[PDB]
Design an enzyme around this catalytic site. Structure first.
Site, PDB file in Angstrom:
ATOM      1  N   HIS A 176      40.901   6.026  -8.710  1.00  0.00           N
ATOM      2  CA  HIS A 176      40.702   6.916  -9.868  1.00  0.00           C
ATOM      3  C   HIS A 176      39.271   7.009 -10.387  1.00  0.00           C
ATOM      4  CE1 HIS A 176      41.509   9.104 -13.537  1.00  0.00           C
ATOM      5  NE2 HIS A 176      40.829   8.170 -14.205  1.00  0.00           N
TER       6      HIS A 176
ATOM      7  N   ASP B 227      -0.213   4.791   1.473  1.00  0.00           N
ATOM      8  CA  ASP B 227      -0.459   5.489   2.741  1.00  0.00           C
ATOM      9  C   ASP B 227      -0.260   4.563   3.968  1.00  0.00           C
ATOM     10  OD1 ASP B 227      -1.277   8.335   3.585  1.00  0.00           O
ATOM     11  OD2 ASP B 227      -2.682   7.099   4.743  1.00  0.00           O
TER      12      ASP B 227
ATOM     13  N   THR C  68      -2.926   1.137  -4.365  1.00  0.00           N
ATOM     14  CA  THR C  68      -3.347   2.231  -3.499  1.00  0.00           C
ATOM     15  C   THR C  68      -4.705   2.835  -3.810  1.00  0.00           C
ATOM     16  OG1 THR C  68      -2.683   4.498  -2.808  1.00  0.00           O
ATOM     17  CG2 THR C  68      -1.774   3.718  -4.920  1.00  0.00           C
ATOM     18  N   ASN C  69      -5.420   3.247  -2.737  1.00  0.00           N
ATOM     19  CA  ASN C  69      -6.666   3.994  -2.802  1.00  0.00           C
ATOM     20  C   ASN C  69      -6.232   5.428  -2.797  1.00  0.00           C
ATOM     21  OD1 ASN C  69      -8.281   1.639  -2.646  1.00  0.00           O
ATOM     22  ND2 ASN C  69      -9.257   2.200  -0.720  1.00  0.00           N
TER      23      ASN C  69
ATOM     24  N   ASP D 168       0.886  -1.157   0.000  1.00  0.00           N
ATOM     25  CA  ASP D 168       0.000   0.000   0.000  1.00  0.00           C
ATOM     26  C   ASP D 168       0.937   1.223   0.000  1.00  0.00           C
ATOM     27  OD1 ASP D 168      -2.301   1.733   0.322  1.00  0.00           O
ATOM     28  OD2 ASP D 168      -2.412   1.402   2.501  1.00  0.00           O
TER      29      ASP D 168
ATOM     30  N   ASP E  24      38.596  13.476 -14.518  1.00  0.00           N
ATOM     31  CA  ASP E  24      39.764  13.144 -15.366  1.00  0.00           C
ATOM     32  C   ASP E  24      39.912  14.164 -16.529  1.00  0.00           C
ATOM     33  OD1 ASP E  24      41.895  10.857 -16.082  1.00  0.00           O
ATOM     34  OD2 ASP E  24      40.702  11.089 -17.906  1.00  0.00           O
TER      35      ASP E  24
ATOM     36  N   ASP F 137      -1.749  -1.174   5.896  1.00  0.00           N
ATOM     37  CA  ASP F 137      -1.930  -0.694   7.264  1.00  0.00           C
ATOM     38  C   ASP F 137      -3.405  -0.764   7.726  1.00  0.00           C
ATOM     39  OD1 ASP F 137      -2.507   1.418   5.442  1.00  0.00           O
ATOM     40  OD2 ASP F 137      -2.214   2.919   6.991  1.00  0.00           O
TER      41      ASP F 137
ATOM     42  N   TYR G 109      44.851  13.248 -25.456  1.00  0.00           N
ATOM     43  CA  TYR G 109      46.237  13.330 -24.945  1.00  0.00           C
ATOM     44  C   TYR G 109      47.240  13.854 -25.960  1.00  0.00           C
ATOM     45  CZ  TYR G 109      44.843   9.989 -21.235  1.00  0.00           C
ATOM     46  OH  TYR G 109      44.216   9.357 -20.199  1.00  0.00           O
TER      47      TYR G 109
ATOM     48  N   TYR H 104      53.150   6.958 -18.458  1.00  0.00           N
ATOM     49  CA  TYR H 104      52.238   6.138 -19.271  1.00  0.00           C
ATOM     50  C   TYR H 104      51.570   6.944 -20.411  1.00  0.00           C
ATOM     51  CZ  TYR H 104      47.946   8.070 -17.210  1.00  0.00           C
ATOM     52  OH  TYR H 104      46.927   8.922 -16.855  1.00  0.00           O
TER      53      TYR H 104
END
Ligand SMILES: Cn1cc(-c2ccc3c(c2)[C@@](C)(Cc2ccccc2)C(=O)N3)cn1
Ligand SMILES: Cn1cc(-c2ccc3c(c2)[C@@](C)(Cc2ccccc2)C(=O)N3)cn1
Lengths: 546, 546
Positions: free
Chosen positions: A523, A10, A122-123, A8, A334, A184, A465, A382
């Site tokens: 990283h 509520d 749900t209502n 439900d 990066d 509920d 690069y 690198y």
């Protein structure tokens, strides 16, 4: 054996329950007990409230019918209502107060992850109040986490009528014994029980959840902290803008509010922001997650010069021009973090605010070549291997699954040397042919990156690069400037290339700079520590970017 | 012979000139004449201002250098500056006050339309002020109307240095005699004159424009009212959202602010909103111009039921869900106007505000079949011809250019009977094979629609009409409701199908309804009367949709 869970709204998925406000108003106003809850249910199945819940009438039409019912009820109990009494005010406040019941949503999320079909039953009413948006936002956040949403006002059926239950069963395509039903209201739970469904009367969440784990055999209570909501590529809005004849930029778009442009690094994707997109959109922003030039569905021209910072920034300006955006907040990681600092330096009028993950802002030394500067730090060695066109492309495109599995790992999961790469003959030398799966990624997430890189490969990405001299010359024009627009620097403790200490002198150029710092983060910041990234970004956005 | 026109920004394309505020401040504060204009130009080519204009420093860095120059200047003239004197406040106000010089922009637009290459050449700064966005917005609006924008702070060159002029010539790829150059500063005009360019000293716009039309031989002054800015499809941001396995929705997106979802009619396109998109985005909205299901780049499944209002509305809700939008204002025309009224009735929580062009809201009669209701009005008889699958498709797909040329015409340009269509054997019976071009559209605009309809044809579009019984049944569920969210009804005097009088009883269902009415306007509202549509929509959006 259970395979579907029904909740439900509520008092179950949302708290405090709107129903309980009738009893609270009575006590607050010292009115006879049940007076308001009686005016609310007046007429029963033929009454104003049932008509509202079935969708015969809207909320704004029901308000005067409720006021009249309150007058009739106070008359019988021989009492008088206060001077400034307003049903609209009472319900406006009750609706505004009602929030998602986070542990209940977490339990529903966990059940779905394990293969359960989930639904909200749900209502509810057709909300046409001036303040209807608050509930619309709530329903939107909630519904996306479930397979089905069944609202009484849309189906013209209501709980406890048995038709809504057979309808629920029909939509679930499951027999009653396969379904758990949480509510509920005992009367609304009754027909599901009478049909053979497992039922839970919900009072306090904790007990309801204990009952739920006992019956499903799945741990839902005291469970580890869940990862933020991610993105399913096929469920996103995909956007495409031609910035020049041969160049189109692709982006994923979600939310409303100030435009927030997310710029990934190398060798990534819009998908690198998967954990940030739903969270930033939910925080009240319009997220534009780019495929940067050279990546995914964006254009990837072959020419090195197409990837210098000047060209990339000019194109990001045109991207905003074409979408009709005078500004966007720019958040980069990066190479995207480098672009974002240059957007702030060269186009401050187009940058609402700037944020970088890992990438510091380091001013150009006009008395030293960038090639000289890079050589001083063995950490960047690198990148010398990325210089020769075709060399890194061949190795990175040789086996995509291996490439991404090797790259995308946490700080303690390193599988690549990343030192003497240029002197050992490759990035993948003495690296496994079949790396293990990192704790950061699923096989499915790696295969998404593999599929994206099948279109253009690594040429365009590597070209980012190959513009060291051009970028350095361009950056030297900005040496007299400062960044005075709102700015955030986010450092990652365990990034061994873009080290937190590289950001130390940034306040000399950005005096108003704000900071964030993430411990035990490598990283790949966004996927390594998604919760902290979101917490840091949302907090800074709300205080500095409007 | 001239083929390029160059305009300055300050005092030429934008007024009041920021320069003139130094003289205005002096007079307002009874300071010595030229005191501020002297502190402004202190140091000449080596001074603070030249460094700022070349991009060596940002505006926020120049402010303290200007304050010190003002102190040094007041010292020499033997005077004292006031207590609450602020250069920032003076420039913030001057920048905020400066607006686009509309007649100058119109002249530049007209020159470009006739084949001229146009450029803005300006001495400007890198704006990092907290209020930089106002200028960013101004520059954005302006630049998109020109082939080039040359800013001194980006090129590191300044007027009157001769390098900027040779650079301008190089970018224009034209010899000096082919170029007109307009500037309000005589000294800055001088090098262009000395190079052989035609020059205009700009004081009052009218005289400058007279000089401009005399030298170009093109009428620029007292010219007819120009149409609003349109859209070039290839320059837009294109968005794509999968709403379900077989269905993706395409949209064009422009601007920032509250989401405004534009829903076209039959047989149209997102392009039907071409004149509204730039205007709504410029008015402060995020425009999402849809290709409705069955059209353009959106999916076109073959099944009739895929096009009932229930399915279409559910999918528009999912579209918002996927983009992360809790609401959007919904603006529709024709079938899009019908969708928009049902969005308001069934999903008010997701509808910020609703507006319809031509299409009225007419409640379902539960005691009469829609087929009976349609038959009562001979105006809707042509829709009976759309019922039989394949019949209208074959005729409408036979010759696309003929289809669109015949349909898209003003009220006085009718070429189709549109009465006894179902009894004459076709929509195009006794209609020209080669219709003339309507005053509303260019050949290029028709060919855009032709190209879009080549993908899916008329099946999906025609299916929108094939759900009368399903739509009527769905609409009957809403009979007890009212539309209480902000709403606009725009009537078109000369729409002979969706007549203004059909909207007369709408206030019974939408009591707070606002209205607009366009005279001498046919069915194709957006392209028939674009200026009035924009005026009506912007005014209503600003007052009722935030
Ligand atoms: C100190 N330091 C610099 C770097 C560094 C590494 C790689 C690259 C660069 C800087 C720039 C942005 C070029 C560039 C170099 C210096 C200054 C501005 C821009 C480029 O194009 N690639 C790492 N540490
Ligand atoms: C009075 N009037 C109705 C129309 C009318 C014409 C065509 C269509 C419709 C109404 C609906 C929307 C079906 C529908 C019919 C009646 C009421 C609601 C919906 C449809 O699906 N196609 C024109 N005048």
């Amino acid at each position: 054996t259970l395979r579907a869970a029904v909740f439900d709204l509520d008092g179950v998925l949302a708290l405090p329950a709107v129903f309980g406000v009738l009893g609270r108003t009575e006590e607050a106003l010292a009115l006879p007990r049940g007076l308001l809850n009686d005016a609310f249910q007046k007429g029963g199945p033929e009454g104003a409230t049932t008509r509202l819940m079935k969708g015969e009438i809207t909320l704004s039409q029901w308000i005067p019918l409720m006021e009249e019912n309150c007058r009739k009820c106070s008359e019988t109990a021989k009492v008088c209502l206060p001077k400034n009494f307003s049903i609209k005010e009472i319900f406006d406040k009750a609706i505004s107060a009602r929030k998602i019941n986070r542990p209940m949503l977490q339990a529903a999320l966990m059940l779905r992850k394990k293969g359960f079909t989930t639904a909200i039953l749900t209502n509810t009413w057709l909300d046409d109040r001036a303040e209807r948006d608050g509930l619309a936002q709530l329903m939107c956040e909630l519904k996306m986490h479930f397979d089905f949403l069944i609202e009484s006002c849309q189906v013209g059926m209501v709980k406890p009528e048995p038709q809504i239950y057979k309808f629920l069963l029909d939509t679930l395509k499951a027999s009653p014994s396969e379904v758990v039903f949480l509510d509920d209201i005992g009367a609304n739970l009754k027909p599901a029980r009478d049909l053979g469904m497992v039922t839970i009367l919900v009072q306090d969440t904790d007990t309801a959840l204990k009952e739920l784990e006992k019956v499903t055999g799945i741990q839902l209570l005291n469970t580890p902290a869940p990862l933020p909501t991610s993105c399913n590529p096929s469920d996103m809005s995909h956007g495409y803008v031609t910035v020049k004849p041969r160049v189109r930029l692709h982006f994923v778009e979600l939310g409303s509010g100030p435009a927030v442009c997310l710029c990934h690094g190398f060798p990534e994707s819009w998908y690198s922001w998967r954990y940030q997109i739903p969270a930033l959109a939910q925080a009240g922003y319009r997220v534009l997650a780019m495929d940067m030039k050279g990546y995914g569905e964006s254009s990837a021209p072959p020419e090195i010069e197409e990837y210098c910072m000047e060209v990339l920034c000019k194109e990001m300006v045109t991207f905003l021009d074409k979408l009709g955006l005078s500004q966007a907040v720019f958040i980069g990681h990066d190479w995207g973090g480098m672009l974002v600092w240059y957007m702030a330096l060269f186009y401050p009028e187009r940058v609402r605010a700037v944020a970088s993950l890992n990438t510091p802002f380091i001013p150009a030394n006009p008395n030293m070549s960038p090639l000289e500067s890079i050589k001083a730090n063995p950490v960047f060695d690198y990148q010398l291997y990325f210089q020769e066109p075709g060399v890194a492309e061949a190795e990175l495109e040789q086996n995509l699954s291996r490439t991404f599995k090797s790259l995308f790992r946490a700080s303690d999961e390193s599988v690549l040397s990343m030192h003497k790469v240029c002197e050992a003959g490759g990035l993948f030398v003495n690296s496994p042919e079949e790396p293990s799966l990192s704790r950061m990624v699923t096989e499915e997430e790696i295969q998404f990156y593999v599929q994206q890189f099948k279109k253009s490969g690594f040429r365009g990405p590597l070209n980012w690069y190959r513009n060291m001299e051009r970028n350095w010359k361009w950056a030297c024009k900005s040496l007299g400037r400062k960044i005075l627009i709102p700015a955030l620097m986010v450092t990652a403790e365990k990034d061994f290339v873009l080290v937190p200490q590289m950001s130390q002198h940034m306040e000399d150029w950005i005096p108003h700079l704000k900071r964030g710092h993430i411990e035990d983060c490598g990283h790949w910041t966004q996927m390594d520590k998604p919760t902290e990234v979101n917490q840091i970004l949302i907090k800074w956005l709300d205080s500095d970017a409007r």
